[PDB]
Amino acid sequence: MKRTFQPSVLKRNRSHGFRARMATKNGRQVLARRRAKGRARLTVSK
Amino acid sequence: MQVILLDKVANLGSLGDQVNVKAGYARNFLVPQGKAVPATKKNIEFFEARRAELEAKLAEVLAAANARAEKINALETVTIASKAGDEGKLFGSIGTRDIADAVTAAGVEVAKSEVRLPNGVLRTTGEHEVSFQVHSEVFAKVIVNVVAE
Amino acid sequence: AVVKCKPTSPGRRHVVKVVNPELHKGKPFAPLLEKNSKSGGRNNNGRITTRHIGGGHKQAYRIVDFKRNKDGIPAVVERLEYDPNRSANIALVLYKDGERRYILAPKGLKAGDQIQSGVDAAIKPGNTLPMRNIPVGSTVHNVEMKPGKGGQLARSAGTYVQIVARDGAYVTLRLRSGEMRKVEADCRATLGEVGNAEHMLRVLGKAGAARWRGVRPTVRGTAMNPVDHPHGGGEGRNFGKHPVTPWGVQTKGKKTRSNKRTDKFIVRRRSK
Amino acid sequence: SRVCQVTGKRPVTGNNRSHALNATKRRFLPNLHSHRFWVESEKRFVTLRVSAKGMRVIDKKGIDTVLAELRARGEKY
RNA sequence: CUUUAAUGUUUGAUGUUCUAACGUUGACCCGUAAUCCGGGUUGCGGACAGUGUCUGGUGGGUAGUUUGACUGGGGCGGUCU
RNA sequence: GUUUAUUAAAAACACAGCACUGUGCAAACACGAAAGUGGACGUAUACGGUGUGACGCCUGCCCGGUGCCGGAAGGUUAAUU
RNA sequence: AGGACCGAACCGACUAAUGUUGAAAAAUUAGCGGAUGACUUGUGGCUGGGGGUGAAAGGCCAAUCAAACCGGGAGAUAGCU
Numbered sequence: 001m002k003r004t005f006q007p008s009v010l011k012r013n014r015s016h017g018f019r020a021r022m023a024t025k026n027g028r029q030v031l032a033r034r035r036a037k038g039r040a041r042l043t044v045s046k
Numbered sequence: 047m048q049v050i051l052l053d054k055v056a057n058l059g060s061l062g063d064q065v066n067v068k069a070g071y072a073r074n075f076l077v078p079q080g081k082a083v084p085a086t087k088k089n090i091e092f093f094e095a096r097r098a099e100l101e102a103k104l105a106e107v108l109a110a111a112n113a114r115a116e117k118i119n120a121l122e123t124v125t126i127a128s129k130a131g132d133e134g135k136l137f138g139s140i141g142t143r144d145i146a147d148a149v150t151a152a153g154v155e156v157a158k159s160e161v162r163l164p165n166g167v168l169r170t171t172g173e174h175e176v177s178f179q180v181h182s183e184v185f186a187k188v189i190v191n192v193v194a195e
Numbered sequence: 196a197v198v199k200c201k202p203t204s205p206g207r208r209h210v211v212k213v214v215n216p217e218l219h220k221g222k223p224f225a226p227l228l229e230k231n232s233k234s235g236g237r238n239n240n241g242r243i244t245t246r247h248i249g250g251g252h253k254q255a256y257r258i259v260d261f262k263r264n265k266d267g268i269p270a271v272v273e274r275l276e277y278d279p280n281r282s283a284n285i286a287l288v289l290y291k292d293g294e295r296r297y298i299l300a301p302k303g304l305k306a307g308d309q310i311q312s313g314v315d316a317a318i319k320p321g322n323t324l325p326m327r328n329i330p331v332g333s334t335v336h337n338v339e340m341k342p343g344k345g346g347q348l349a350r351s352a353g354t355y356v357q358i359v360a361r362d363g364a365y366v367t368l369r370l371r372s373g374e375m376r377k378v379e380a381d382c383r384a385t386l387g388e389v390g391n392a393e394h395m396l397r398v399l400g401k402a403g404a405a406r407w408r409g410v411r412p413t414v415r416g417t418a419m420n421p422v423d424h425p426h427g428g429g430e431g432r433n434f435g436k437h438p439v440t441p442w443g444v445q446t447k448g449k450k451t452r453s454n455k456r457t458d459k460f461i462v463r464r465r466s467k
Numbered sequence: 468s469r470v471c472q473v474t475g476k477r478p479v480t481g482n483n484r485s486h487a488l489n490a491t492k493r494r495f496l497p498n499l500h501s502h503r504f505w506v507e508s509e510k511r512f513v514t515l516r517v518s519a520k521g522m523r524v525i526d527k528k529g530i531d532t533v534l535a536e537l538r539a540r541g542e543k544y
Numbered sequence: 545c546u547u548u549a550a551u552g553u554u555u556g557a558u559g560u561u562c563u564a565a566c567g568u569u570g571a572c573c574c575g576u577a578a579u580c581c582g583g584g585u586u587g588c589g590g591a592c593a594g595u596g597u598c599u600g601g602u603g604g605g606u607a608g609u610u611u612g613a614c615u616g617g618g619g620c621g622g623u624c625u
Numbered sequence: 626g627u628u629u630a631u632u633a634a635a636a637a638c639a640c641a642g643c644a645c646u647g648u649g650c651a652a653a654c655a656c657g658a659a660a661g662u663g664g665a666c667g668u669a670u671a672c673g674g675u676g677u678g679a680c681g682c683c684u685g686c687c688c689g690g691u692g693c694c695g696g697a698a699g700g701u702u703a704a705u706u
Numbered sequence: 707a708g709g710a711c712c713g714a715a716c717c718g719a720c721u722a723a724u725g726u727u728g729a730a731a732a733a734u735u736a737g738c739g740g741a742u743g744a745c746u747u748g749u750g751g752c753u754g755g756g757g758g759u760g761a762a763a764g765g766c767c768a769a770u771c772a773a774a775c776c777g778g779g780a781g782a783u784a785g786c787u
Contacts, residue, residue, distance in 0.1 A: 001630070001731065004768050010750065033777090047526030069522045070591080073530075075564050078505040086529050131266060135313030142586060162563060162590070164459075165364065166342055166381030169325055170314065182564050204710030206626090206744095209641060209679060212707090236655095238663040241753045244655040245664040245673075250744090256666085281667060340649090343571050343587045348649070351671050356649095372649060372669050379588095395670045400679085402626085402640035402761085403709040403744050412627090412639055412744090412761040416675065420764040422756080422772085425605060426675090427764085432637080437692035438645090438675050442654075443605025446675040447646050448693030451653060455593040456567075467646075467694040469659095498596035503565080503583095512583060519596065543575090544583060 017045040047072045048085030050093050052100075054108050056183065062097030062104065064090065075182070078157060111181055114151035118180040123173060123191040124149055130194040134171040140190065141167060145178045149188065156182070168192060197396045209400030213393060219276050223255070227295065231256035231280060233409060246441070251407040254279040257297040261337055262346040263385050264323045267316060268292045269309040275300060282352035284391040299350070300390025301336045320387030326366050327380035333358050335368070336385040338378065340457070346384070352394035367462075375463045416441070469499045471518040473525050473533045504530060513537065513544060 014020060021027025034042060049072045054061040058071055064085065076082040083093055126148060129138045145167070146158040156179055167176045173191040180186045196215060202208040236248035243249065257278060270288045278285035288298040301321035311317040314328045321336070329335070334355040337346025348356045348370070356376075360367035365377040399405065402412065417434045421427035426439045438446050448467060470477060476497060482490045498519035506513050515533050517525065525533055537544075 001733095002769095003731075004770090008749085014751090047522045049526065070565055072526070073504065073522075074566095077507070078564085080507050084526050084529060086527060088529075131313045133313035133315040135266070137266075157564090158585070160563065160565095160588095160590090161586090162561095163588075165379035166587090169327070169381065179563070181562090183562055185562055198707095200708080204708070205679090206641095206709050207707095210708080234663055234665090236663060237753080238656065239661065240656060240663095241751095242656055242663095243753080243759075244657090244662080246655075247673085248664065280665095282670060341570075341588045345570085347668080350668060353670055354668095370649070370669080374649065374669095376649085389670095391670090393670095397670080399641055401709050401744085404641080406640095406709080406744055410672090413674080414638065414760085414762055415677090418638065419760095419762060420772095422764050423760085423762070427762095434676085439605080439692085440647095440654080440674045441605095442674090443603095444647085444654080444674075445693040449647060449653090450694065451647065452649095453593075454649090454651075456589050456651085457649085458593090459589070461649080465646095465648075496596060500566095500595085514583085543581085 013045060017043050049073065049076075049082040050085055050090065051076070051082050052104060053081050054105065055111060056181075062093075062101050064094065110152055110154065114156070114180050115184075117151045118149075118186055118188050121187060121189045122150075123189055125191050125193065127193050127195050128168075130171050136169055136171065136192070139166070139168045140176070140192065145176065151180060151188075197393065199398075200400075206401050209398055210404075211396065211398040211400060213277075213397060215275075217275060219274055223257075223276065227297075229256055229258050235409075247411040247413045248409055249411045251409045252279075254407075254409070256280045257285050259285060260296050260298040261350065262323065262339065262383060263298060263301065263310065263321055263337060264312055264383060265290075265310040266312045267309060268294070269307060272304055272306050272308070275304050281350065282391065282394050283350065283389055284352070299337065301385060302387030302390060302392075304390070317386070321385060323383055323385045325380070326378065326382045326384050329358065329384065329386070331358055331361050333386065334388050336387050336389055338368075338384045339382040340460075341379070342381050342383070349389050352389060352391035354389050373465050374461065376460050377462050378460060468516075469497065470516060471497060471499065471521055471524075472516045472536055473521055473528065474518070476518060506530070506534060511544075 018031075021031060031042070047069045048064070048066045050062070050064045051058065051060060051067060051071075052062055053059040053076065058065070058067055066085075072082060073084075083089075126140055126144055128136060128140060128144065131137055142158060142161050142163070147155055161179065167178075168174060168190065171192050171194060173189060175187055176190045177185055177187050180188075196213075198212050198214050200207050200210050231254055233254075235250070236243050236245045238244045257280065259281075269291045271291065273287050273289040275284055275286050284300045285297050286300055286304065288296055290296070303320035303322075305319070308319055309322075311319075311322045312324075314324065316322070317324045326339075334357050335349070336355075337350065338348040338356055339345060340347050354371055356368050356370045358366055358368045359375075364380070366380050367375070367377055369375045406412075416424050416426040416439065417428045417432060417436075419427045421429075424441050425443055426436055428434060428436075440446060444451075450464075450467065452464075478494060478496050481493065481495045483493045484490060498521075500517045500519065500521060501514070502517045502521075503512060503514050505511075513534060515525070515530075515537065
């Protein structure tokens with residue numbers, strides 16, 4: 001029947017981008033570990 | 047906390063000599079009107095010198111409440127003008143802010159503050175009995191007479 | 196009046212509505228319409244914390260004057276309307292001084308009648324008085340709790356908190372809660388019943404009337420599992436514990452009161 | 468917060484050690500009286516966060532030192 | 545000594561009461577033609593609810609564990625020196 | 626109408642009503658370090674939770690135990706003076 | 707008017723035939739019920755794992771639910787194979 005992934009990129013952008021997570025401490029440590037690993041897609045919001 | 051208590055009246059009062067007291071008497075009841083000096087042990091020997099000079103002057107500042115105890119315990123009409131409705135309704139009333147500051151007890155303030163008042167005062171023009179704070183601990187009657195502005 | 200349905204289908208068998216020929220069958224005039232919105236029982240956390248409140252129709256909100264206090268300015272009473280946010284009807288009262296309010300209905304609704312205040316002036320229903328100057332046997336509209344706290348008691352349609360003594364320094368009145376209080380005479384209160392006295396002839400007759408009122412359905416505790424609710428039962432329901440809430444409180448017990456600030460005025464309370 | 472502005476004390480770690488001697492944590496909490504005072508030099512009311520046995524601390528040190536840390540904190544009153 | 549009056553004396557308990565601490569998802573002015581916040585005032589409660597420290601009763605509402613071997617497999621049963 | 630996405634789809638679940646009870650509104654309740662907010666900015670002809678299940682005729686005995694409320698004259702009684 | 711109805715479009719799937727190393731996340735074909743509503747439902751948003759949210763099945767929570775996922779603790783421990 002219906003599958004678990006569906007269209008809307010809107011529900012991604014404010015959960016899982018940059019500027020609103022950098023504003024917090026904890027958001028910066030997700031971003032720190034990801035930059036330090038060497039992953040090229042930093043938020044996948046591109 | 048201890049202080050050096052400068053009052054002479056009420057439940058505690060030793061006129062400038064140090065006597066250690068509970069902490070609700072110390073500072074918060076007396077210093078909103080500058081009636082104690084701290085037991086800080088930097089100046090306490092000077093304070094016990096200073097009293098010998100100070101007290102006879104300080105005793106006349108402590109003849110302020112005696113007036114109030116004279117002038118309200120033998121009552122007369124405290125005349126207050128307040129804003130009347132067309133049927134004499136005191137919308138505004140006297141309440142706490144006119145009973146504090148214009149009363150003839152000492153012709154001065156007793157700090158307006160919080161009051162217990164288990165029901166109103168003053169609700170139509172004319173005279174009425176009003177039981178209010180002639181002193182911080184002591185609830186007593188004055189008689190009021192209200193006229194229109 | 197009341198309109199009861201002829202039982203032309205199941206679920207419409209016991210359905211009853213409140214109607215009055217005078218009711219405005221429009222939508223209210225919107226520049227003066229002051230926006231409800233619901234929180235559907237969700238608090239700051241983004242969690243549901245008052246359980247089973249949630250859903251239904253939008254139900255707009257009017258500011259309402261809940262003391263009805265006014266010196267001597269006449270009111271034309273421009274319409275009496277159904278209010279979606281409480282039991283009682285709410286008037287648009289239009290005063291002749293050019294002031295529009297919304298105001299809670301009293302037993303009064305008279306065209307051109309005046310809301311007076313002060314002792315010698317006030318006597319028609321809806322005209323405010325200090326409680327000293329109102330007679331014994333009076334039903335009273337909207338009681339001031341302490342002077343300046345406003346009319347917090349008897350607000351829902353046709354209810355009252357009736358004066359039953361007046362001896363001493365206080366006035367004694369009984370509440371439809373079973374409570375009986377003393378209240379000081381310096382409080383303001385107002386004449387007549389609360390308006391919309393016919394509300395009580397509602398019978399609802401379908402689960403959907405409470406659904407649009409933002410009241411959600413609620414399961415039996417004994418029909419939930421022991422893990423999902425502290426009472427919950429086994430294989431074939433097995434009712435036979437003592438009944439409980441989902442948080443461990445006794446449903447047929449407790450006096451939970453700890454307000455301890457207005458308690459000098461309650462001279463008898465509801466009791467287990 | 469729950470800071471006693473006058474001694475610079477705070478809650479601190481400590482285990483129960485119950486009647487069966489169990490090491491469940493409870494942690495100990497200062498009584499932390501949120502207390503008003505008067506200042507003659509400003510002719511205003513100030514609020515200083517005090518604890519139990521905190522009143523004798525304000526007396527013996529002086530209000531003045533405590534009051535200067537409220538100025539240092541940046542807060543309004 | 546028991547009951548006990550007069551009453552010297554220290555401390556624990558009590559009632560009634562004030563506002564002066566303390567309370568205010570009461571209201572008003574004000575910062576501020578900011579529903580917050582904070583001081584003030586005013587309505588009302590009040591040295592009490594409160595909270596901490598100390599300690600005892602109640603309490604599966606909640607969470608972590610626990611609930612025999614032997615034994616012609618055994619549950620159960622019966623027994624353990 | 627709801628239902629274990631794919632064993633029921635109903636004998637379970639819901640509901641008006643019907644019985645029990647909490648709550649006087651800073652409510653009962655809830656979640657959150659706690660501020661706090663939702664309930665509801667409504668408020669007993671209202672709101673939570675509980676048992677029963679529209680409607681006609683009804684529901685006799687009984688709190689013992691189980692959970693839970695509350696009151697008092699007082700013998701003793703931790704902590705404590 | 708209607709928590710009414712027969713019924714497409716629109717949505718579901720009580721039962722039956724089939725499928726079961728299917729085309730399939732129970733779909734298909736036929737009987738069948740909601741669709742003038744407690745229906746069907748697009749957009750933007752939110753609560754984070756014995757925690758949520760439940761008209762109740764201990765349901766559902768990223769092709770998944772009587773215990774989601776990952777990164778550390780971690781070479782858990784094993785009285786045992």
